[PDB]
Structure 1
Amino acid sequence: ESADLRALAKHLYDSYIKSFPLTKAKARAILTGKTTDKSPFVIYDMNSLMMGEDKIKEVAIRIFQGCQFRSVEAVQEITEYAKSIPGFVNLDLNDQVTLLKYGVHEIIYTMLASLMNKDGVLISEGQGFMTREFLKSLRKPFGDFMEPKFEFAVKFNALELDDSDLAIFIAVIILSGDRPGLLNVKPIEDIQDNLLQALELQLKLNHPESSQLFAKLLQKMTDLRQIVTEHVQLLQVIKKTETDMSLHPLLQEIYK
């Protein structure tokens, strides 16, 4: 029954809206100028950055520490969303922890695309915007840490998914039966089979005129992995270059 599927879809959408305070729908209204009260302050160089701090320890480290604390905040939000996915909380405790460990970054990059256009990225709950060119001009190694998230986002945003599509997608990501070290793969695969079915219906109904959207979006999951791997390689370099800079405990266990 596709009705059971549309009900799963609506439940996931509703949890997503409750769990994440900056939706894609809000992010697009900020970025495309449906605003007199929604316009961001734009940071594109060093003075506007200082100006920024006032209207909202080198600079590359500050930005990077800022990104750290925002991923941790995202993790907490993703962790709340996951508990809402039917069956997730009934899984073995170890598998819950495994699924979140490998899933949280794929989800963060997916949702990050909603805050991006080819020119920059919304920051600080949409009150700021930081240009892609300013991010790329930071001292090495930090200079090109965001470049591949931007290249991902231009491609992924061309799919034109909205929040209700993303809610099912992100659920499909967490419920991955092939994560290393999973004790009990079958209960996961059954949850994910049901999600895949919901996603397939959602995309058919929400994008009737968009041939094979479902398959194209599943192929994107490969780009996400590639983003994670590069990013882990970049973290090993930072570890050795700055012995004074501190990864956040929550993030250190994820990566461990």
Structure 2
Amino acid sequence: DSLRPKLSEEQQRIIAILLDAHHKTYDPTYSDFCQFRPPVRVNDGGSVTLELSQLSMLPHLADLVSYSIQKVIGFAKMIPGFRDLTSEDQIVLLKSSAIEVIMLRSNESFTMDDMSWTCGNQDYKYRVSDVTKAGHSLELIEPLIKFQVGLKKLNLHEEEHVLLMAICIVSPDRPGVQDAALIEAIQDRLSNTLQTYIRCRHPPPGSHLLYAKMIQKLADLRSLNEEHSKQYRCLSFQPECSMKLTPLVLEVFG
């Protein structure tokens, strides 16, 4: 059975655009990271009370996430069709997808060598313990690491990666969207591109139900999104927390 239509010229163009958009918005040398407020790692081999007292890693990780949100805004703007949406719908989609696209794009620095996000020397190597020093708990972090491993092991082509990030952003089932049908049309064009790509270009056995595995990752992301939001709320109750964040982070997660 399994028909394998060739990518259309339009679908090839969509893929080219998204690759270019990623290459322009994702620096794989992490060369800007020395501009963030510095990482600080307090002794915390154990403590939620101490973590909240210090939030030693929060200014660095908030800057990292803020920077990443800016990059995702830039990427989104280059997604074919995104600019056909109204401004209110663009913003709803960005704010609701931001943490999920950050999680997806971070997969590129994530390494199964030692289950870290390695963005340079020791200073810019991020482990579970660094995320607890920014005030999050294991209810978010452990499923996040499991998600990163699961995604890594799909061995996505860059084409598939950038399409998944685009599909994540242009989702019609986000609360507060107005033109759901237009968003769904944009998404379907990207989804069809991805399905076609996988069937033409992705060798076996990694192609086996790869599309369904990728859609499952999107569902997984909704769950992480909800847990992050719960935890962010609690972190936001810590006095003086706002100075450790950024204006963009406060808006997107507030």
Q: Decide: shared fold, TM above 0.5.
A: yes
Cross-structure match for 1:155: 150
Aligned residue-pair number: 225
Residues 38-79 of structure 1, C-alpha deviations (whole Å, 9 max, x = no match): xxxxx9x769xxxxxxxxx99952312211111110011111
Is 1:2 aligned to residue 7 of structure 2? Answer: yes
Report 1:200-239 matches (<5 A). 200-209=195-204, 210-239=207-236
Q: Could you say if the C-alpha distance between residues 251 and 14 of structure 1 is closer, same or farther in structure 2, counting changes exceeding 3 Å?
A: same
The answer to whether the 8 A contact 1:178-1:185 is kept is yes
The answer to whether the 8 A contact 1:113-1:150 is kept is no
Cross-structure match for 2:35: none
Q: Structure 2 counterpart of 1:77, which letter?
A: K
Measured after TM superposition, the shift of residue 101 of structure 1 is 0.8
SS of the residue corresponding to residue 62 of structure 1 reads coil
Cross-structure match for 1:67: 61
Cross-structure match for 2:3: none
Q: Structure 1 counterpart of 2:59, which letter?
A: Q
Q: Could you say if the C-alpha distance between residues 211 and 96 of structure 1 is closer, same or farther in structure 2, counting changes exceeding 3 Å?
A: same
SS of the residue corresponding to residue 116 of structure 2 reads strand
2:240 and 2:176 map into 1 onto residues whose CA distance is 33
SS of the residue corresponding to residue 85 of structure 1 reads coil
Measured after TM superposition, the shift of residue 126 of structure 1 is 3.0
Structure 1: gaps of 5 or more residues: 28-42, 48-56
The answer to whether the 8 A contact 1:72-1:250 is kept is yes
Is 1:91 aligned to residue 96 of structure 2? Answer: no
Is 1:19 aligned to residue 25 of structure 2? Answer: yes
Residues 122-170 of structure 1, C-alpha deviations (whole Å, 9 max, x = no match): 35x434453636437749x545353332121111111111322111111
1:159 and 1:244 map into 2 onto residues whose CA distance is 41
Match of 1:171 among 160, 166, 170: 166
1:92 and 1:157 map into 2 onto residues whose CA distance is 34
The answer to whether the 8 A contact 1:60-1:142 is kept is no
Is 1:243 aligned to residue 249 of structure 2? Answer: no
Q: Could you say if the C-alpha distance between residues 143 and 182 of structure 1 is closer, same or farther in structure 2, counting changes exceeding 3 Å?
A: closer
The answer to whether the 8 A contact 1:9-1:202 is kept is no
TM-score by length of 1: 0.78
CA RMSD of aligned residues (A): 2.7
Q: Structure 2 counterpart of 1:222, which letter?
A: A
Q: Could you say if the C-alpha distance between residues 64 and 205 of structure 1 is closer, same or farther in structure 2, counting changes exceeding 3 Å?
A: farther
2:169 and 2:201 map into 1 onto residues whose CA distance is 22
Match of 1:192 among 187, 195, 205: 187
The answer to whether the 8 A contact 2:116-2:128 is kept is no
